[PDB]
Amino acid sequence: TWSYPVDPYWMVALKALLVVVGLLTAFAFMTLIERRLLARFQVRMGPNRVGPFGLLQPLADAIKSIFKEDIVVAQADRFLFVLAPLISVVFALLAFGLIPFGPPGSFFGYQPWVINLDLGILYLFAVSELAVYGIFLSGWASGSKYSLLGSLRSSASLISYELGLGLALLAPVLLVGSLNLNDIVNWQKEHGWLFLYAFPAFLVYLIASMAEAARTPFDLPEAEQELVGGYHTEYSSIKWALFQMAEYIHFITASALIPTLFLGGWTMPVLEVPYLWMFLKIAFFLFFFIWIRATWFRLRYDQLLRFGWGFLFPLALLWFLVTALVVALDLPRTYLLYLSALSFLVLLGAVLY
Amino acid sequence: MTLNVGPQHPSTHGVLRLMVTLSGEEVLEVVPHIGYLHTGFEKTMEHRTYLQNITYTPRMDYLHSFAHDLAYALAVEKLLGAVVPPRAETIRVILNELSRLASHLVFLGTGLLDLGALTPFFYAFRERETILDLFEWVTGQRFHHNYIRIGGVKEDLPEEFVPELKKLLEVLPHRIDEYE
Amino acid sequence: MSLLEGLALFLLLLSGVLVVTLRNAIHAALALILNFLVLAGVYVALDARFLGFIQVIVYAGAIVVLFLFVIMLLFAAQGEIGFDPLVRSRPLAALLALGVAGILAAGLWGLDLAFTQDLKGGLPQALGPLLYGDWLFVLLAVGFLLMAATVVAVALVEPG
Amino acid sequence: REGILFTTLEKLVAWGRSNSLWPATFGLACCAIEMMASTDARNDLARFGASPRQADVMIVAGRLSKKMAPVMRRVWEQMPDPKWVISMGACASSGGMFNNYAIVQNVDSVVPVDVYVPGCPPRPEALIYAVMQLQKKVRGQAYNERGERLPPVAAWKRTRG
Amino acid sequence: MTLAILAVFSVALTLLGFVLPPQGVKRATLLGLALALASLLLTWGKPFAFGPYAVDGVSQVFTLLALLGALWTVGLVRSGRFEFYLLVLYAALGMHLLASTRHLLLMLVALEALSLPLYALATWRRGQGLEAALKYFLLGALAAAFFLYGAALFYGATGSLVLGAPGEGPLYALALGLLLVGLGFKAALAPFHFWTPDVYQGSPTPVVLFMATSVKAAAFAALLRVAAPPEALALLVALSVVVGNLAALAQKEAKRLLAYSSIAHAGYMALALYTGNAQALGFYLLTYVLATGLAFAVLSQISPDRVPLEALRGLYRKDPLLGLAFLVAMLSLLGLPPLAGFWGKYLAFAEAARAGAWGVLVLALVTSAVSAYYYLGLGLAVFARPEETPFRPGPPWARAAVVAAGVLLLALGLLPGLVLPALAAGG
Amino acid sequence: MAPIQEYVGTLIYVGVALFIGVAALLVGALLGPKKPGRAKLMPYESGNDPAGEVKRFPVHFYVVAMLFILFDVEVAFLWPYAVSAGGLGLYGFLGVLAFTLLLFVGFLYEWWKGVMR
Amino acid sequence: MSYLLTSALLFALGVYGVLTRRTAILVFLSIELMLNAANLSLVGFARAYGLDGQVAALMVIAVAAAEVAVGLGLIVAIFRHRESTAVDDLSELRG
Ligand code: SF4
Numbered sequence A: 001t002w003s004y005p006v007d008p009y010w011m012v013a014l015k016a017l018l019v020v021v022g023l024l025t026a027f028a029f030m031t032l033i034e035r036r037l038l039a040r041f042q043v044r045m046g047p048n049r050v051g052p053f054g055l056l057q058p059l060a061d062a063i064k065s066i067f068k069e070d071i072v073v074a075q076a077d078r079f080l081f082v083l084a085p086l087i088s089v090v091f092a093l094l095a096f097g098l099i100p101f102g103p104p105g106s107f108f109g110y111q112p113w114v115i116n117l118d119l120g121i122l123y124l125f126a127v128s129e130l131a132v133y134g135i136f137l138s139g140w141a142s143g144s145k146y147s148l149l150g151s152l153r154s155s156a157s158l159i160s161y162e163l164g165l166g167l168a169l170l171a172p173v174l175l176v177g178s179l180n181l182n183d184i185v186n187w188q189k190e191h192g193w194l195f196l197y198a199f200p201a202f203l204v205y206l207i208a209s210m211a212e213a214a215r216t217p218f219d220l221p222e223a224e225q226e227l228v229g230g231y232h233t234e235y236s237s238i239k240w241a242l243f244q245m246a247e248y249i250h251f252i253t254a255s256a257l258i259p260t261l262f263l264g265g266w267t268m269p270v271l272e273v274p275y276l277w278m279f280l281k282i283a284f285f286l287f288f289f290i291w292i293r294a295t296w297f298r299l300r301y302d303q304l305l306r307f308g309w310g311f312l313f314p315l316a317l318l319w320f321l322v323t324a325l326v327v328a329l330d331l332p333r334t335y336l337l338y339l340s341a342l343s344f345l346v347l348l349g350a351v352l353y
Numbered sequence B: 001m002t003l004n005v006g007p008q009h010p011s012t013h014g015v016l017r018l019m020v021t022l023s024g025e026e027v028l029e030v031v032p033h034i035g036y037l038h039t040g041f042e043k044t045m046e047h048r049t050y051l052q053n054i055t056y057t058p059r060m061d062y063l064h065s066f067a068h069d070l071a072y073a074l075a076v077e078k079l080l081g082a083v084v085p086p087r088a089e090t091i092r093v094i095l096n097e098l099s100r101l102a103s104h105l106v107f108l109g110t111g112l113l114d115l116g117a118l119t120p121f122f123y124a125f126r127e128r129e130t131i132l133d134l135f136e137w138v139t140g141q142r143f144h145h146n147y148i149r150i151g152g153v154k155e156d157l158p159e160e161f162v163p164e165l166k167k168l169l170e171v172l173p174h175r176i177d178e179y180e
Numbered sequence C: 001m002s003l004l005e006g007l008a009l010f011l012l013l014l015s016g017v018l019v020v021t022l023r024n025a026i027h028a029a030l031a032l033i034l035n036f037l038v039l040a041g042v043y044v045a046l047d048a049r050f051l052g053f054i055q056v057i058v059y060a061g062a063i064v065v066l067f068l069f070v071i072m073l074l075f076a077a078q079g080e081i082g083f084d085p086l087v088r089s090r091p092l093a094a095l096l097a098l099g100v101a102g103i104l105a106a107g108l109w110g111l112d113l114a115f116t117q118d119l120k121g122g123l124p125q126a127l128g129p130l131l132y133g134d135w136l137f138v139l140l141a142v143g144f145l146l147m148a149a150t151v152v153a154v155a156l157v158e159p160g
Numbered sequence D: 001r002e003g004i005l006f007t008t009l010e011k012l013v014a015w016g017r018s019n020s021l022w023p024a025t026f027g028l029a030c031c032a033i034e035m036m037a038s039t040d041a042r043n044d045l046a047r048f049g050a051s052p053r054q055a056d057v058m059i060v061a062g063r064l065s066k067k068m069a070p071v072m073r074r075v076w077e078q079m080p081d082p083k084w085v086i087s088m089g090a091c092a093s094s095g096g097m098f099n100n101y102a103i104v105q106n107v108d109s110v111v112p113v114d115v116y117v118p119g120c121p122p123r124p125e126a127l128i129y130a131v132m133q134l135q136k137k138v139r140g141q142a143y144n145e146r147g148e149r150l151p152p153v154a155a156w157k158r159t160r161g
Numbered sequence E: 001m002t003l004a005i006l007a008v009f010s011v012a013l014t015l016l017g018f019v020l021p022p023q024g025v026k027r028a029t030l031l032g033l034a035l036a037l038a039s040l041l042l043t044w045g046k047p048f049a050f051g052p053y054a055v056d057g058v059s060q061v062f063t064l065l066a067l068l069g070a071l072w073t074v075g076l077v078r079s080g081r082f083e084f085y086l087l088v089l090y091a092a093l094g095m096h097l098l099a100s101t102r103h104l105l106l107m108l109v110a111l112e113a114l115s116l117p118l119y120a121l122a123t124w125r126r127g128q129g130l131e132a133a134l135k136y137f138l139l140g141a142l143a144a145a146f147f148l149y150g151a152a153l154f155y156g157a158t159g160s161l162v163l164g165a166p167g168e169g170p171l172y173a174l175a176l177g178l179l180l181v182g183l184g185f186k187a188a189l190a191p192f193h194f195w196t197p198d199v200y201q202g203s204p205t206p207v208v209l210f211m212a213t214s215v216k217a218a219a220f221a222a223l224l225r226v227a228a229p230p231e232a233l234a235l236l237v238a239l240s241v242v243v244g245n246l247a248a249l250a251q252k253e254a255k256r257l258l259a260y261s262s263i264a265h266a267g268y269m270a271l272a273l274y275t276g277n278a279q280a281l282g283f284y285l286l287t288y289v290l291a292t293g294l295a296f297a298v299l300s301q302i303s304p305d306r307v308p309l310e311a312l313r314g315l316y317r318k319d320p321l322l323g324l325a326f327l328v329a330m331l332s333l334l335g336l337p338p339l340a341g342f343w344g345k346y347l348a349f350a351e352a353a354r355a356g357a358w359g360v361l362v363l364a365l366v367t368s369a370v371s372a373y374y375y376l377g378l379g380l381a382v383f384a385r386p387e388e389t390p391f392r393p394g395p396p397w398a399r400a401a402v403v404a405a406g407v408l409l410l411a412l413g414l415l416p417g418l419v420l421p422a423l424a425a426g427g
Numbered sequence F: 001m002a003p004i005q006e007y008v009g010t011l012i013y014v015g016v017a018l019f020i021g022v023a024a025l026l027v028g029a030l031l032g033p034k035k036p037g038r039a040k041l042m043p044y045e046s047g048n049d050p051a052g053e054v055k056r057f058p059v060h061f062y063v064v065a066m067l068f069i070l071f072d073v074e075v076a077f078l079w080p081y082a083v084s085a086g087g088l089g090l091y092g093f094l095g096v097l098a099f100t101l102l103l104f105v106g107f108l109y110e111w112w113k114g115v116m117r
Numbered sequence G: 001m002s003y004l005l006t007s008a009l010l011f012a013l014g015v016y017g018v019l020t021r022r023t024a025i026l027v028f029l030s031i032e033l034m035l036n037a038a039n040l041s042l043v044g045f046a047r048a049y050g051l052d053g054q055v056a057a058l059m060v061i062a063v064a065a066a067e068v069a070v071g072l073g074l075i076v077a078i079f080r081h082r083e084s085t086a087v088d089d090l091s092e093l094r095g
Helices: A011-042 A056-063 A079-094 A119-144 A145-176 A181-192 A196-213 A236-263 A272-296 A302-328 A334-349 B041-047 B065-082 B086-114 B121-139 B161-179 C002-021 C023-044 C049-075 C087-108 C124-131 C136-156 D007-020 D030-035 D069-077 D122-137 E002-019 E024-044 E057-076 E085-097 E104-121 E127-157 E170-185 E195-204 E205-225 E228-251 E254-269 E279-302 E320-334 E340-354 E358-371 E372-379 E395-413 E416-422 F005-030 F060-083 F089-113 G002-020 G024-049 G052-078
Strands: B001-005 B015-020 B028-032 D022-028 D057-060 D084-088 D113-119
Touching: A011 A056, A011 A236, A011 A272, A011 E104, A011 F005, A056 A236, A056 D007, A056 D069, A079 A119, A079 A236, A079 F005, A119 A145, A119 A236, A119 C049, A145 A196, A145 A302, A145 C049, A145 F060, A196 A236, A196 A272, A196 A302, A196 A334, A196 E085, A196 F060, A236 F005, A272 C023, A302 A334, A302 F060, A302 F089, B001 E195, B001 E340, B015 C124, B065 B086, B086 B121, B121 B161, C002 C023, C002 G002, C002 G024, C023 C049, C023 G024, C049 G024, C049 G052, C087 E127, C087 E170, C087 E279, C087 G002, C124 F060, C124 G052, C136 E002, C136 E372, C136 F060, C136 F089, C136 G052, D007 D122, D007 E024, D022 D030, D030 D057, D030 D084, D030 D122, D057 D069, D057 D122, D057 E395, D084 E170, D113 D122, E002 E024, E002 E085, E002 F089, E024 E057, E024 E085, E057 E085, E057 E279, E057 E395, E085 E104, E085 E205, E104 E127, E104 G052, E127 E170, E127 E195, E127 G002, E127 G024, E127 G052, E170 E205, E170 E228, E195 E205, E195 E254, E195 E358, E205 E279, E228 E254, E228 E358, E228 E372, E254 E279, E254 E340, E254 E358, E254 E372, E279 E320, E279 E340, E279 E395, E279 E416, E320 E372, E320 E395, E340 E358, E340 E395, E340 E416, E358 E372, F060 F089, F060 G052, G002 G024, G024 G052
Parallel strands: D022 D057, D057 D084, D084 D113
Antiparallel strands: B001 B015, B015 B028
């Protein structure tokens, strides 16, 4: 925050609240869109009933949800069962704040973000650990071990790739030289589109985000069809809704973060209207990810650990040292345009034999 | 960990109960426990006419039912020494194999879903729907069709069955390949 | 400063008291997590910021999660089992606790320091040249310590 | 608070639930495969949970064996409260064509039935008719042949215990 | 650049042992350690500092000793796990680092480096060895906490985490105390001694050789670097020697007895700490390390798990040379002439009296006479009629090792005017 | 650096989020039927025992966690270099490389031994 | 300055824990709390003496992590087969 202003604490608050409830309506309507987009992929139709577009069905659903009877299991730790859903949502919502959707002053006088800070990615990392805390904790809190085991599979896997995200994030930091999202973005304004320079790390970041419930590992798990996922399976009315809510906000936070960092989110080469583009990129990754949600198999997490731990993460720190070598010896930043382009040429061509 | 995979949950398919003797992520031994669907045909059917039984035959394997129909019809015909007409036999091979395509379509639909992911249940379901529409056309029923008879079959095929079997016989080669 | 400062330090001590008091291990560890949050906050207020963030990430995020995995993997939540309580020790344990504060209190009493240097907030930006720099050897030694740690920890388990 | 006591509020929540009616399927025989067809065409329903915990509507689809009864019992009990039971097909509803030692001759013995759906198997669209029934049943829009209006939730009427 | 050699071999053998038979790895680790010692001799009089890392006469002598101990302990251990070598390698570097710096925090990291791999070396997995390992880790990490808050308080009273910083009144005093706690625990001075009886008895004997030589060496090496005041010194000495010898009297078991005895011995060496002569202390530890290394090599040739006192008996008849050597070790550890142990003791006592601390010196000496009870209770026990006892009479490796060590002992008993001329600058 | 001013905004953000979450819990808890019975409270699957009795768990989760602590410490150290890097020159890079390779030897060890286990 | 005093207090608390706790693990945690007391004091004095105490503390955190990994490994090995940990359950080694 060398170059960027601060709105008064009341306005920071108000913006925070707007972003939270905005994220509420966001998650619900996103559930509708994925329902139907999936329906198109599998050549059926969505829910038009309880319409008009079918888009009043989160009202109906939320309405079921509350008035549903929130059940607290005995044989569940009384304090932890309640507290668990609380944690998972709190640490999910926060840190979508940081993401700038526009230049300063452009919020109608103020600030497209909520908070910016000076240490950016670390905040994200920090908040990311704590949701997982919520996961394995709920697994305990429920005090059904069937729930536990799954929560443990979950946590082990998540934590694995969660490590992956860091060594992913190292490379682009070298180039920009800042821990701030606005600076990274602006770096992409001038030198342009970090994934041009950073590509392998782009790959390992994205796929690292597969672990965080994104689908294609999925021995996350959802309880479905396996040794269950754990955390949900013991909760009913509001609390269950809270867990689902958190996992989805994380999904869109990631769909925002991917353009924000490696691409130029907002801050596109041309047109450069402030909000619309970040929402569009969000939409792009969101849709592509939904395709991923539908159209690919599971890992078992035996493999998922193999894939992230054995493949993604070593690959991640390998590229870091390369970009470290390049930035340390100051050569040009061109060598990374060339290198990333070339590595992309490799990591693609070996698919089509 | 002798893990108890329940009767109907969690997605251990078709109401089986499994005592997975299992420590860790492997599987030591699963001690299977059945009997949850026991309807008791072998007794009930001792109380039904040989004709009446033909309504109870499709009902066990409900996916490939006509194999039940065929097996039972045959064993009785043999036992009472009946002579099945060629066109009936042909229709019975057609229906048997069509019911087979239905069953198989189901098997791989569920299989692909069971571990792995959701999408291809639907295409198999589309082809199965064309098959079930064939069955409805000829027998008036989706399944459990009371059609096969100890003589032969209940009645003849309507005008519209032939054209529709072709349609599916046309898409299926391309179609089966798509699943493949 | 003092308005909230009192509050934050109070929360620290309270949390510690919990982690040493509660005979629910999970509750304990969790109280220590709360502790690490507040402590990281205080670190930042104290112009050490990066150290705060690594405090949360590693200490809170990683370490105590491994702990939690251990106590969840082994139960032990109800620590007080099988006893040898030797109750005459609890006040004696509590006694000794008071003394180690007293001696430190004395050494820090009548101690005034210049808590004024322009640290510029303990961002890794200015910390890096110390790390690879004056502390680089300490660093490499540490790294070696970690490597030895991983192999130790591995051979330590490694049923065969 | 169970969806009740403001003319605006209860109606509002009651639509919420009816249109939200959240089937938790309890497959048994061939009827379950006839409900897997229903999964295709569906549009207030067919998201699940699947886990019982998360759902209002229990769909009993197939022959319920006597050995199987105490199980379905707890699954029903282990559901949140505002919950409904649809009974699918002859075997479930009455004893069906299997009248014998093996099978429950009405599922209403073990779980409070809200709606019944005849057929062997019933066409899926009949089950839509039944969930529209139950849709419109929990709206308190439902009547029997005697003239009586029907309660939104049966199993608000049994004594638990 | 002995450090170079150490880091290199450890890191390399780590992955190498995947591709090597465990014996090949043993051959390797052995080779590495011996090479590092070679570099130590070729650098005598060549003192070298890099980072907080610093090699001088002290570092040189004390890691000469430590390296010697590591080689001897690896000699005995034939287990077909390449790690049971690797850990020793790690530990050795860790001890080198500990002796080689004034940086409190680097000292901390070095402490973890040496101490963590010994915890794992505590497992033959015999039921005691887990108890031993446990007590060791818990008390160890506790002391870690202490030395760390100590470094923080040193940085507290003064601008540096490096020792020798000018120093305050009471806060400085406090900080030096908090460093003295951990550094003292590592050396088995009383009343920090409680682990010593349990861990020596619990851990497999050869490992204990390694500990009881190398660890004590490195620990005194780092101790000399600290500024410790006379009164505290008095206390530690008094308690160590008293409880050490007195409780050693009560000992029925060779290893445990040796533990208590070693508490008394740390007590004796702590006198050199009065002047911190280190030519004197260097010498003392030369003599002690040789004798003790010997003693535990023999206790290894009896049994890895536990040795009772009677087991030592009749050892002369069985093997004459080992009986004699064990005897000599008992006498050198007694501090009796004409053995090098007497000159080490004398050098410490000389520095003590030089510092003008009399009562302390006296008590140390009196209870040092107390120690002769068990020292002869072993050394002479060699000659009694052999009872039923386990004996595996070694390779040439062990026979030539033990005898060599003894000979080196008595050689410097008669001619300390050989090595003592340079335990100093290295002339 | 950057102001303290924004961080207080972060505290704000936390307060707002926490408040909204608690409000959600309050709506859930307050608006429901409520009917505790022995049957409802009881864990899962009709005659129960899904969890059953198990004597603890695979250590695999422990291993993943311990791995994670060490590698995360690695990253915690790698971050300060990643920022000032071209600033620390070739020798900086060489130090960071030393450290990195050290801990990578660590990872490589535990891999070739592996934790299928 | 309040901070240094509180760090000392925390150290004390961790002490109370270590002496009190019946189980191994909670002892270890109390130890961890002590270690952090140290780190905080380091931070205060870093702000006083210029920032080397900070790097110190970082290295410390790393140290702590290593010994945490190792120590939990040992805690697991000692009572994996064995039943409830309570540290008094091992008395075999006596003077
Ligand atoms: S009613 Fe008919 S279709 Fe349904 S389970 Fe019974 S036999 Fe099968």
